[PDB]
Amino acid sequence: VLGQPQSKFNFACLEAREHCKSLGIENPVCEVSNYLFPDCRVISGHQEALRFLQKNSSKFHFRRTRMLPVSGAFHTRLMEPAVEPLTQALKAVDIKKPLVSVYSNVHAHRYRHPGHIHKLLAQQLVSPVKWEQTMHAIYERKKGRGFPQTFEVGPGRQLGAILKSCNMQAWKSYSAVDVLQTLEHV
Amino acid sequence: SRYSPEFKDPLIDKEYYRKPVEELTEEEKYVRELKKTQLIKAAPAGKTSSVFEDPVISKFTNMMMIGGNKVLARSLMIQTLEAVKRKQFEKYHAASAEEQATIERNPYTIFHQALKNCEPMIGLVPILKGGRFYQVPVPLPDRRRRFLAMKWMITECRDKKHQRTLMPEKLSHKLLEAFHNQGPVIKRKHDLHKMAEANRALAHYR
RNA sequence: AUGAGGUGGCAAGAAAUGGGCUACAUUUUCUACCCCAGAAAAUUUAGC
RNA sequence: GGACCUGGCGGUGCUUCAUAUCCCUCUAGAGGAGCCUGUUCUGUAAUCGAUAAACCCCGAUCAACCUCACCACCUCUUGCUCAGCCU
Ligand SMILES: [Mg+2]
């Protein structure tokens, strides 16, 4: 959902839940799942709530609405059954101290002590992704000061567009690694 | 101000000075003699004795300017003029023999007439007397309406609904629409003339 | 002892309001240049 | 008691105009987003606290086992200098 300045997100989620309560289901789920860049979020939950939001976008002041091609509502309490499995698999693994500053998604700050990554990697499963906060925490600085180079190591260029929306100046020094073709045959 | 009160504004009109002394009236002779004694300010960058100078287009360019970037504003103005000229030439080449006599190809004439077609003569003045705001009709001065036409044209061309359409192209289209008494600026003039007719009973508050 | 030291503990939550820091683009952005190029995509606070 | 003089009216209303401050007029923000925050309330035995005095190691940034303040236990003393005290 891409909102405008007059868009109220928690409010619209509230009516999206009222609709499903009126229909009648156990504890309807509809909350912001991803904060990507200003006024753009990803809502997650039951398809009825998302359809309500899509059909009442005009009332909710949503400029654009696009259903993601994903299996289900990620980053919500609906994914709770997937927490206990992952935890066990992470229990055996010995996580060391990161050599570089690795930023988290649950609270959008650097991982400090290695013994807390174990539970943060599981809370990330059922917590919203704080991408905008992470971008601020990495690139926030005074006007005029230089920005670091940015490399998107992986498929696609979505993070490039998100960074462009978040910080234009940080985006000026952004580049993407081509994983579909290579200029030179090494 | 860095000019003393004695300093007077200069007169750049070139043909005024070539006026024969015989034509000069006694009052005009007196003022010409008086200006001799007065101190004159340096002519500002801008107006010139050029025969192609147009104060209306200069004011429009200054009103489009952002952050003092006058080069870009003049570039946009000349691009708009060229676009209007080329559109009129294209429409002229494709017109019938009798239809070519009523097709104006002078961009300056089109610009002036389009701005004149958008000038409102009456406006409103917010006035709160009884604790509630009251919009009262008032006759607009000539300068006020000349300014309002320009401001409405520029604001209409600055709307965000026009996505990625460059300013010269939008401005030429709006100018050619207003030349024919069409478009949203003419409608904004009409909706002001109507909303001031709907409150002709409030003129008694003036 | 209103002086000097040892030991441990002290981690806080809610709204309602005020301020501050960041990006916010087509009159834009990147390269060459420093201006004739190529690509991308309502309230209210101040001032004159 | 007759006639007259000066008035004041800390005067009251209207009439005409000077009628500038202040509105209206012009420009740019602020209503959005993410943070940190001042205040207020409530809480604990305790203080939510302050870094010309910590940590940092692109930029910043939280407690730091810091440190001064505070709570609970204690200890030093004629001691630094006829001492000492950010009362
Ligand atoms: Mg505390």
From Swiss-Prot, chain A:
The active site is at H75. GO terms for cellular component: mitochondrial matrix; mitochondrion. One of its GO terms (biological process) is fatty acid biosynthetic process. Keywords: Disease variant, Fatty acid biosynthesis, Fatty acid metabolism, Lipid biosynthesis, Lipid metabolism, Mitochondrion, Transferase, Transit peptide. It is found in: Mitochondrion. It comes from the Eukaryota. GO terms for molecular function: [acyl-carrier-protein] S-malonyltransferase activity; RNA binding. The modification N6-succinyllysine is found at K119. Catalyzes the transfer of a malonyl moiety from malonyl-CoA to the free thiol group of the phosphopantetheine arm of the mitochondrial ACP protein (NDUFAB1). This suggests the existence of the biosynthesis of fatty acids in mitochondria. Also acts as a mitochondrial small ribosomal subunit (mt-SSU) assembly factor. It is linked to Optic atrophy 15: A disease characterized by visual impairment in association with optic atrophy. Atrophy of the optic disk indicates a deficiency in the number of nerve fibers which arise in the retina and converge to form the optic disk, optic nerve, optic chiasm and optic tracts. OPA15 is an autosomal recessive form. Belongs to the type II malonyltransferase family. This is Malonyl-CoA-acyl carrier protein transacylase, mitochondrial.
Curated annotation (Swiss-Prot), chain B:
It is found in: Mitochondrion. CDD domains: uS7_Mitochondria_Mammalian. The modification N6-acetyllysine is found at K174, K194. GO terms for molecular function: mRNA binding; RNA binding; rRNA binding; structural constituent of ribosome. Keywords: Acetylation, Disease variant, Mitochondrion, Primary mitochondrial disease, Ribonucleoprotein, Ribosomal protein, Transit peptide. GO terms for biological process: mitochondrial translation; ribosomal small subunit assembly; translation. GO terms for cellular component: mitochondrial inner membrane; mitochondrial small ribosomal subunit; mitochondrion; ribosome. Component of the mitochondrial small ribosomal subunit (mt-SSU), essential for mitochondrial protein synthesis. Mature mammalian 55S mitochondrial ribosomes consist of a small (28S) and a large (39S) subunit. The 28S small subunit contains a 12S ribosomal RNA (12S mt-rRNA) and 30 different proteins. The 39S large subunit contains a 16S rRNA (16S mt-rRNA), a copy of mitochondrial valine transfer RNA (mt-tRNA(Val)), which plays an integral structural role, and 52 different proteins. This is Small ribosomal subunit protein uS7m. It comes from Homo sapiens (Human).
